[model samples]
Target: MEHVAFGSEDIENTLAKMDDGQLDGLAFGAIQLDGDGNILQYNAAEGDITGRDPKQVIGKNFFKDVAPXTDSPEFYGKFKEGVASGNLNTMFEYTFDYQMTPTKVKVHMKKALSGDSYWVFVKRV
Candidate 1:
């Protein structure tokens, strides 16, 4: 782990080499998803923040199962386009509607260096 922060400049490259342990140690929420939107890695911080069990979401579709509200173009569209274009480095403010809690947060999406997965970093606003 080399000084990973939510605002880190090229986080995709750093996160690509990090194991689950390193990702879990971060203060922010870290989630890794496949091209098809399947949840690959859900870190502890995100599970705690969203009150979702990482075990339950690890193999599920993020847009359909985990968060149906985000299935639209605003959230899922950026990811879909990023996957298709092969360059997914974007950041924006978003509100997470989870379990009656509408938390405003900053979301960062990036394509991993391996080109096999995407990394999402979320921090409370």
Candidate 2:
């Protein structure tokens, strides 16, 4: 597969085709989470961008534990709706300001075609 840019449309399909290593090679942060908000895959860019170790977040509840700031209706609510419909493709501007440095980034949430996993792409603004 060719390189997938952070703003590419139909990004879910491209992300589904990538492995952990390829995801890590991305310039922006990439995270794969389960339907229940459990983080399954956390890429190197995400770790570096967030200043958090991948091992510290993988297997943890994304909405509740890792990123509690996103536990609100606008964020986690959108995720639940996506899982219910089996189609999650959303992009919005956000600020990650809960427990870390306030970072402004564009966040894209997408559902994988091959499974129940959801992919989140974050690019600094």
Candidate 3:
């Protein structure tokens, strides 16, 4: 199989489908983060991967509160760098290794297509 499946085209098509399963499926996790790493959106899929309650995560900082393992400068640097790059979209992959288990996730940040909010598509490897 390929490394990751939620590329730009995949995201666009799936989201536009408006099907609940397509958006909240177990195949992947989803979260929306702000420019300062604040958690804007966290759903059931995200909770399954993190093995934590989704209720307490919203409005918290993703890198600091949600996933402090990525609090390092290296991780944040790449994250913001990709988002700020001169393009319509920014995407990168990272493995979540903070709590119960390590999970590989692909982060696709939306810039031009979705206004101010950024979309993060997470998947377990």
Question: Candidate 1's residue-wise lDDT over 34-125, tens digit each?
Answer: 99999889988888878888778899999988888678888899999999999888898888895649978888889888657998888888
> Model 3's lDDT to the true fold?
0.63
Per-residue lDDT tens digits of candidate 2, residues 1-125? 24778868877767776877788788889899899999989999888878889778899999988898898888899989988999788889888887789998899998877677998889899
Let me know the TM-score candidate 1 reaches against the reference structure: 0.92
Comparing 1 and 3 by lDDT, which wins?
Answer: 1
Cα lDDT tens digits, model 3, 1-125, are 11235664666444532333345553566666677778766667778878866668878988778788777755666667656772436566777887667777766655424444556666665
TM-score of each: 0.92, 0.92, 0.70
Give residue 116's lDDT in candidate 2 (0 to 100): 72
RMSD of each: 1.6, 1.8, 4.4
Residue 37, candidate 1: Cα error in Å is: 0.4
Global lDDT for candidate 1? 0.84
